[PDB]
Design a protein around this ligand. Sequence first.
Ligand SMILES: CC(=O)N[C@@H]1[C@@H](O[C@@H]2O[C@H](CO)[C@H](O)[C@H](O)[C@H]2O)[C@H](O)[C@@H](CO)O[C@H]1O
Ligand code: NI
Ligand code: NI
Ligand code: NI
Length: 759
Amino acid sequence: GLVPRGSHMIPALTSNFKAAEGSWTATQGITVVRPEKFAASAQLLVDELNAYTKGTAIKGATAGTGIEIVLDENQKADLGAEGYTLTIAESGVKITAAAQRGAFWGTRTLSQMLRQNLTLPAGSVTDKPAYAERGVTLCACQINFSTEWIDRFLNEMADLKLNSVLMEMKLKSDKFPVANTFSYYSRDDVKKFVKKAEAYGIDVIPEINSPGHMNIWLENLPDFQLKDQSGKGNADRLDITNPEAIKFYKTLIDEYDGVFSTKYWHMGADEYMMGASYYSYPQLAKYAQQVTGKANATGADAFTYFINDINNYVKAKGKTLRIWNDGIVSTRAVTLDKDIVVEHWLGSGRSPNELANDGYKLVNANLNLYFARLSPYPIQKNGPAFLYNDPSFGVDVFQGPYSRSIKVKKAENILGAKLSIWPDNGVKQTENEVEADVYEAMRYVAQITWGGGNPADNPTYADFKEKRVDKVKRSPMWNNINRKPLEDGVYTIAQPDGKDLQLSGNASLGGNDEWTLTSTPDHYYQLKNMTSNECLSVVSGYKHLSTVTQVGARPEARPCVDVSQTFTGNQTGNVGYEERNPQKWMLLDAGDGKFKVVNAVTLQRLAVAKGTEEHIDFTTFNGVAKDTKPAAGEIVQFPDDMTDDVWTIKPSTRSISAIAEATPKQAYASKDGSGASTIDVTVANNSKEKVSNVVVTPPVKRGWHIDKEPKTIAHIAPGESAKVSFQVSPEWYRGDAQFEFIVTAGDEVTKASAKVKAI
Ligand SMILES: CC(=O)N[C@@H]1[C@@H](O[C@@H]2O[C@H](CO)[C@H](O)[C@H](O)[C@H]2O)[C@H](O)[C@@H](CO)O[C@H]1O
Ligand code: NI
Ligand code: NI
Ligand code: NI
């Protein structure tokens, strides 16, 4: 049994679990009884129950015994839209709610209990959320999040009763293909994860940030860029005075409408000038004074007029507008509409307390809950303890100027709070690192937004962590991929029924070539070409946030580096990410030995170009025109929706194998040879036929005395091995030195490398 009742769950229950006589045990005999409209919401619970009870017979059905889910509108006043009652009796479990959202949250509580013990104590509890929006900002912006990551993230949020995610992202545009710079998302891909969110009660709100931070949309559209008095544009800012540019944005709004089901639209409205001055663009002031009919209209007025126009437009679609609070500026002939939700993050401009007093609905998008890959925030550096343990902190505490905190007193106008996940540099961290980084903060934010504060039985953060965070494992359905399909080793890489893949400087469809896969702690792979001694990477091409976003970008060979470390929190010791992470690859089991190969941070698939693919990156980028079209047979990276190319990765078949090891690992210049390292190279016969006349050829290297002559082994039988040694001594060379030995047997050729430090 789980005793004390409900002391090991997140969020904690908001009222006490009343104990009753007896218990109830989940077995493979139970059923999840639920109405058909709730089938999709119950599927997660069904799958978890089968995981928990180590079987596969549990189903969701409209009749049966076990766990009953009842949706009863009559309970709307007592439970609200998200409250539930959980009842456990010897006879079974009953979850009651007024709507789907609340019943689902009930299944999360139930699952977390069964996650710890199959036998549950009898009793009942009513659980209700303190705030209506319990949120995350996910900037899938400029850089990309793999669809698998998002699917896992929806599971992460769902199990914690988080119900709101703002996803700043690019949806592949049908009408404006010239603006489809990667990152973008397939429409079907978004429909898929938006559908999962609907089943889990998660409100997915899209964001196209405007009228600033629009580099991703206007790079290839100079005519919609705001221009200086000298006529110079800048893809960062949309010309809000141009009619076709407003039409362009509004078309994007429409395009998003067909895949997002939310009632909200977030136009961003980060400060338009981004630190510049409106006077450098007098056509904004002139547009303002024309549209208001007032001569005293300012540039900030035009910014607010834009905000209001988009407000009316989304309102005509029955939607509600959302903006960041730093988009609320001082005006003259235009006043900001009041039916817009304000997400407050910056301690500047109109105070959040006065905004709430004036009727605005507020989200606490608190800067203390920020995550970034480039410059880590305090919550990453130190964990949430400095907030949890701060009794002057809570959902109702917003940030103010000069480090002051402001308690918004009209709490009823506070919708809730959210944490924020920003990239800033797409290669400093991988997405799987991000997924580890937010673990504690997701639980903390879930706790304070559902409960309205800390659990009463966890005085300090250390207690919350020991009794809850460390005890509540994730749902067994969180993980959705084989994180290490292939073990570390030597493999061949080729197309299904085609040539193999080779790489020296550039990569190409070669033939007869070995690779070495080395798994990484964040569940990626390093692919080392064992002939060229260089690693497959992606570093050359058009970029956003130091990450290659050019479609069709050309993988290339790069010096192999250390890929054994992963970095979260403070990222202590995180150097070399510019080479490390472009070298890392996700390998997705495609069945039958085939594998989708996706770069870890550019998130595009290793592909064989066809000569028939089209994209803007093939013709121009940011006003500068240059043709990069891949020809048929060229090796490239491609978004998921422009390729089915998978890759056959299989352990090597070669009949000969060579291994070279030196002794010592360090060598020093020597006139008697005492610092001379002897590199023993040993050849091994893998298959079943006597190999003869095996030639081992040593390398030749600047500043080293190496035995010049090759050695030959007369015979080696199947499953045997033979050994020959060459001596190396440095002269004026110092530092790391790779030694490549060539082994040739008949038509077959392989190499063996060794490393020696010259001191
Ligand atoms: C509201 C806010 O926090 N704004 C700044 C963030 O700017 C975002 O940056 C991403 C890429 O990193 C997109 O370009 C998005 O459009 C921007 O709004 C910034 O990322 C973080 C700090 O890293 O906070 C603000 O500075
Ligand atoms: Ni316990
Ligand atoms: Ni910025
Ligand atoms: Ni992991």
